[PDB]
Amino acid sequence: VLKKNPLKNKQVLLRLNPYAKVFAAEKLGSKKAEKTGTKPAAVFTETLKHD
Amino acid sequence: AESHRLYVKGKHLSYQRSKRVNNPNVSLIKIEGVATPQDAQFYLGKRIAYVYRASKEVRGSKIRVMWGKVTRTHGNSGVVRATFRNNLPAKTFGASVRIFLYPSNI
Amino acid sequence: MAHFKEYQVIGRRLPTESVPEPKLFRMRIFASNEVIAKSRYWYFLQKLHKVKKASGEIVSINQINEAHPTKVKNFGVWVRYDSRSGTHNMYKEIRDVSRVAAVETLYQDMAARHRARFRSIHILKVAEIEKTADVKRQYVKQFLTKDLKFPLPHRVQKSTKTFSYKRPSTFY
Amino acid sequence: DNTLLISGPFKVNGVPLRRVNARYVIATSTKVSVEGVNVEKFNVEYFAKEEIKAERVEDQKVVDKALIAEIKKTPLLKQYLSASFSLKNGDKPHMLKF
Amino acid sequence: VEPVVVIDGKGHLVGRLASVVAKQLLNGQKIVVVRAEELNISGEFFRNKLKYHDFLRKATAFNKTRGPFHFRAPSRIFYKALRGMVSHKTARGKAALERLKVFEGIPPPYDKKKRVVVPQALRVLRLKPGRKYTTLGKLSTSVGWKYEDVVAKLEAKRKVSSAEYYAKKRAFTKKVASANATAAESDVAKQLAALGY
Amino acid sequence: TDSIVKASNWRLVEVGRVVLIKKGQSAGKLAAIVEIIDQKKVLIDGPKAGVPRQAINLGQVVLTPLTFALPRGARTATVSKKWAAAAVCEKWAASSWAKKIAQRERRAALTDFERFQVMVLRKQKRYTVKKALAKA
RNA sequence: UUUGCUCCACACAAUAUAGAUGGAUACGAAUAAGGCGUCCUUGUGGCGUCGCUGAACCAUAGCAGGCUAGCAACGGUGCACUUGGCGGAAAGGCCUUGGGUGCUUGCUGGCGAAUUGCAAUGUCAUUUUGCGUGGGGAUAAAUCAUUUGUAUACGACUUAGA
RNA sequence: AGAACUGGCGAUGCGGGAUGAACCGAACGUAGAGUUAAGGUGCCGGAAUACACGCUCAUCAGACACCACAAAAGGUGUUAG
RNA sequence: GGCCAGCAUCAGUUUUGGUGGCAGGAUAAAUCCAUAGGAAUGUAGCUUGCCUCGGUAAGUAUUAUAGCCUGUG
């Protein structure tokens, strides 16, 4: 009789989408990445800074 | 003391209006000391009273009151919207209202 | 347009069985977003070469930032602008901290002094002048003068309340 | 019943053991210690309703004693409580750090 | 906030002061304007004089007593400018205009009261230095107003009496500054300095 | 009998002039003009105050009568160094204008009980001063 | 001309409020300039400080502000008198003398304030009128009609009449 | 005056263009709350006498579509090229 | 148990704030540090007139009794 929004009302957000629980548990919206030590090529940097 | 004032004193400006239409059901209020929406946010939800006088004595008093409450900010200059139970009769454009400090939250 | 930005847009013909790996052109575009950037890019390449967004490709959209956004520079700018009855060229001098800023106040300058719009104005070139004496415009040279000092007379205080009690002054 | 219990204290500014509501008070920053007071006794039955009662007057005294004693420990606090609040000209409640 | 606000039109610009005043009146404020002979208009004298003559040519042809009424005094030029800014054919407009009062000079009830200014209406702040401005008593005299020298004599008189008052005031204020800064060594005054006074 | 000219001393914009940012993020803070860009634009910097090095408008700042010594176009550490070696924050706080700003801030930060106290102290002071004025 | 009219003081009714609720807190001129203070040989002078706005200044504690007892001080302030002076631009206000009387929160204490029963303007202002009490004071005119013609369509105007 | 293709007025209110059959926005059950279009925010008038860059001072300024007009030609007037 | 209200806890629509964590970019650009080079709206210093001591007018000198720009990391 009345529509209820998920993204408020965790109860409907949990009957829909069981995975929201573990999403919140692991937090999975501030997931830290693995840092890679890549450097762009001198050709790229020269082109970006070219006149 | 000299003073007994627990209410900020404001002015009833026009109604909510277009250039050529008005909504009596929303009145515009200027609160003294208030020149920003960020300051008017303090006063949101506060009670307003327009106190007036009449000759007929009704229940011990010749004084009558219209209650209202602040609802939202209006504009950029601290002007505020209010909605009273029974609206303000438009004779009160430029008249003085009493913005009380309850419901309080500090 | 808006608060500008500077991009390199790199672009290409669509590869063919005849011509794989086409030639990769590039432009430094002044625009407030990537969309206007790519648009200006296809505008200027659709002028210069036989290409269009349909028969072409955008390979890179990269943002260029000032290497030194705190060093004051003296920019020369070469402009082409469609006036009402004709189209002309120009050189201008702009002392500013950044290219985006110089080009912003340039568009504003053209709008004010020559009534020219973003659509009418091309930006042929923007170039920092390494040394003084290769400047040609008094309205930059007079700030390039040594030991520069000046006042700002007639200081106006913006008021809060609509009634004052003091009859203010302009001391400074 | 979602209320606040208050005392003036009654001998200080004339306000007895009274119920009030939280949305009708300004919480100031000024704080005496309730430690040493026995207000657990009170309830909506205490303030129930159908000249002053001995329970009321005597309980007011018992609270006032310890509370006033703690209030002496701060200068001008008795006179602060005795005084009443009023907004003066130029007082802007949205910039008063109560 | 104050019940009556006595503005001193010296240095003020007619239109900017007029709009400020009108809105205050409609918001429900009593304003009285004094020394409106010293009120300024932008542009040069000849211009503002021609504009007056253009307004003066206008007149109901079949009865010029019915026509627009061309008031000459600076107070009434101000009133004209300001009633253009008020919705004056309403009860509300009439009420605002009754809250209003305007004067050439500073007459007896308001010479003993403080005068105020309006920085968003002042010539010296608004106008760029260089631009030529006009003075409304000079204009009004040129287009018909008679009593420019009566006001000048009376204002000379008033300025004398007020300068004497200010001498007394300044002497007593010297006395009081002495009596205060001799007591800015007490513990009470140092406590006030701590708290902000 | 010598010539007389007042000359109307101004506070100038110049490398070394120390400004008071009044609006913005900094907004109530000290900075210093490193280099002049135009009649209205200056590069400022205050590293002790947190103020980033940046171009700003001379109406968004207000100049101060204080001045210290800087070479043209100096870097941020340099201006920090010479700021400290001039010790100009002490001069600014010595000023009667910094005192007024702090006076405003303290008066704002007052609570109701500090304010009652202010009142009592003022009544006491004016008792003393009116007694002293009845004499002289 | 009925023992009516008016001014003042009080009391009671009604009358409404373009709309009080700590204070409209007084130089003048300038704005590429000034204010305040000080000094002098008194000026378009030297020195110092201030301004970057009234978020200032004054006032403000007490049963809507009660009754009390003292300490200090010779001050502040309310009222009713009272001395003189100034002010006509719409002055109708500004200043000042002397005492009478109260209050003082300048300081320290005593008593009381409860039930408006968890908030309801919770009435504490101004204006006018009217009958009534205490007194003081003054105790005419116009119009109709008659009349005149310096006037006139009628009104009106000019005139006269105890 | 007369054709082509769409869209509208007619037959249709509402918001804006002061005012207007047809322009702009959007089409109308009775309400309430919120957000917006077009157009605007000195005062009349709801909303910034907002921020920023510059040009213009008219002893005939100018002030935004339909739209209620102005041209050729001229000026060590000012500004930039 | 009828009329007018107030507070709390909730539901829906909505608005205005405070705050935390995370990713991308030249894995921001800068700043800062180090390093190489450079000059000038030429700092210290030196040379020459004015020179009332002092500083000036030039010449030299590019970090020294101040700094700056560029490139690399």
Identify residue E77 by its one-letter amino acid code.
I
Of E114, E116, E119, the CB nearest to C168: E119
CATH number given to C3-69: 3.10.20.10
Angle at Cα D56 formed by Cα D51 and Cα D61, nearest 5°?
120
Reduce the DSSP state of residue F33 to 3 states and report it: strand
Resolution (A): 2.9
Residue the block writes with tokens 């001498």: E167
For residues C44 and C27, is the Cβ–Cβ distance under 8 A? yes
Q: Crossing angle, helix E91-99 and helix E14-27, to 10 degrees?
A: 110
Q: For residue C2, which of C33, C42, C43 has the smallest C-alpha distance? A: C33
Query: Distance of alpha carbon E64 from its chain centroid, rounded?
Result: 31
Residue the block writes with tokens 């309340």: C161
d(CA E11, CA D68): 61
Same domain, E157 and E117: no
Tokens of C33: 């977003």
Q: How many CA atoms lie within 13 A of A17 on its CB side?
A: 13
* Number of folded domains that form chain E: 2
For residues C147 and C136, is the Cβ–Cβ distance under 8 A? no
Identify residue F79 by its one-letter amino acid code.
V
Give contacts of E 107-136 with C, CB under 8 A: 114, 116-120, 124-125, 129
Give contacts of B 76-95 with E, CB under 8 A: 93-95
Pairwise CB contact (< 8 Å): F111 & D80: no
DSSP string across C35-100: HHHHHHHHHHHHHHSS--SSSEEEEEEEEE--S-TTS-EEEEEEEEEEETTEEEEEEEEEEES-HH
Pairwise CB contact (< 8 Å): E117 & C164: yes
Q: For residue D68, which of D5, D8, D2 has the smallest C-alpha distance? A: D8
Min CA distance, F136 vs chain E (Å)? 8
Same domain, E39 and E88: yes
CATH number given to B1-106: 2.40.10.190
Q: Which domain holds residue E192?
A: 148-197
**Phi/psi at E33 (nearest 5 deg)?**
-110, 130
Min CA distance, C118 vs chain F (Å)? 24
Q: How was this structure determined?
A: cryo-EM
Q: Which residues of E104-142 are buried (b: 16+ CB within 10 A; e: fewer)?
A: bbbeeebbeeebbbbbbbbbbbbeeeeeebbbbbbbbbb
CATH number given to C70-146: 3.10.20.10
For residues E76 and E100, is the Cβ–Cβ distance under 8 A? no
Distances (CA, A) of F1 to B56, F4, F6, F63: 83, 9, 16, 37
Give contacts of E 132-191 with F, CB under 8 A: 175-176, 179-180, 182-183, 186, 188-189, 191
Chain E contact for C16, CB < 8 A?
no
Which residue from D minimizes the CA distance to F120?
Answer: D76
E28 contact residues in B (CB cutoff 8 A):
11, 93-96
For residues E9 and E103, is the Cβ–Cβ distance under 8 A? no
**Phi/psi at F121 (nearest 5 deg)?**
-65, -35
Which long-range CB contacts under 8 A does C116-120 form with residues at least 24 apart? C116/C81, C116/C82, C116/C83, C118/C1, C119/C82, C120/C81, C120/C82, C120/C83
Q: How many CB atoms lie within 10 A of CB E39?
A: 31
Chain C contact for A49, CB < 8 A?
yes
Q: What is the CATH number of the domain that holds E137?
A: 3.90.1180.10
CA of residue B57 to C1' of nucleotide G124, angstroms: 17
d(CA D98, CA D27): 7
Q: What is the CATH number of the domain that holds E181?
A: 1.20.5.4280
Instruction: Strand H: list positions under 7 Å from protein Cβ.
Output: 15-17, 32-34, 42-55, 57-59, 61, 79-81
List the F17-21 sheet strands across, edge first.
F51-57, F41-46, F29-36, F17-21, F61-67
Pairwise CB contact (< 8 Å): D85 & B6: yes
Identify residue C12 by its one-letter amino acid code.
R
Omega into D9 within 30° of 0, i.e. cis?
yes
d(CA A40, CA C105): 33
Pairwise CB contact (< 8 Å): C8 & A51: no
d(CA B106, CA D97): 9
**Phi/psi at D62 (nearest 5 deg)?**
-65, -35
Min CA distance, F91 vs chain D (Å)? 30
Same domain, E138 and E176: no
Chain F contact for D28, CB < 8 A?
yes
For residues E102 and E1, is the Cβ–Cβ distance under 8 A? no
CATH number given to F12-94: 2.30.30.30
Largest interatomic CA distance in chain F: 62
**Chain F interface with D: residues with Cβ < 8 Å:** 108-113, 116-117, 120
For residues B84 and B23, is the Cβ–Cβ distance under 8 A? no
Q: For residue E33, which of E73, E70, E68 has the smallest C-alpha distance? A: E73
Domain boundaries of chain C, sorted by first residue: 3-69, 70-146
Question: Which residues, 6 or more positions from C56, have their beta carbon under 8 angstroms from its beta carbon?
Answer: C11, C12, C13, C14, C42, C45
**Cβ contact B75 with chain H strand, < 7 A:** yes
**Phi/psi at A19 (nearest 5 deg)?**
-75, -10
F73 φψ region: left (φ > 0), alpha (ψ -120 to 50), beta (else): left
Identify residue E119 by its one-letter amino acid code.
P
